[PDB]
Design a protein around this ligand. Structure first.
Ligand SMILES: c1ccc([P+](c2ccccc2)(c2ccccc2)c2ccccc2)cc1
Length: 165
């Protein structure tokens, strides 16, 4: 599989986090979650705050300690007072395998996620199950078959993997 290595410093994310019973239960609600954020003007409002640390809007899957799975729609931002009643997290510094899903959203992203899922099975010691992974949506027509969604999977010690020696 094709991917790029990237590294991020610690970042401040601003948005809204919801929590679902698990990873599968989330998949049916995450679509509705996006829809509500658009409808209520949350996406438009968050886009104003995007400081461009990451270029686009994020959908982060955050694991919870009780097995639940949260999803956060967010942008990279900063200034606290204007941050207001949004949810805020610090995304801890990490290296990433960054994959590209080209095609109309969400189908292309769903299909690429399945492929990524199968691919990283072989990197058990390098993936970070406790760290958030995310989709990054740049500006563009998400219904275009040329549209690219990025999928960021955090990793540690990947240079030690025997496949790279
Ligand atoms: C709990 C939460 C997330 C993952 P995973 C993963 C998939 C396959 C093999 C090992 C790990 C994942 C990846 C893509 C979609 C869904 C779940 C995962 C999480 C963070 C970083 C790397 C891998 C696993 C368990």
């Amino acid at each position: 599989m094709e991917y790029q290595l990237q590294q991020l410093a610690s970042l401040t994310l601003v948005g809204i986090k919801e929590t679902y019973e698990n990873g599968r239960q989330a998949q049916q609600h995450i679509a509705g979650f996006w829809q509500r954020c658009y409808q209520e003007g949350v996406i438009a409002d968050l886009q104003l705050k995007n400081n461009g640390d990451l270029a686009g809007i994020l959908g982060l899957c955050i694991p919870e300690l009780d097995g639940k799975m949260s999803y956060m729609i967010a942008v990279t931002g900063d200034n606290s007072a204007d941050i207001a009643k949004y949810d805020v997290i610090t995304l801890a510094s990490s290296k990433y395998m960054v994959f590209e899903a080209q095609g109309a959203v969400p189908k292309a992203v769903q299909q690429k996620m399945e492929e990524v899922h199968h691919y990283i099975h072989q990197y058990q010691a390098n993936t970070v199950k406790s760290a958030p992974f995310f989709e990054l949506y740049q500006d563009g027509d998400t219904t275009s078959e040329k549209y690219i969604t990025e999928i960021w999977m955090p990793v540690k010690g990947l240079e030690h993997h025997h496949h790279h020696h």
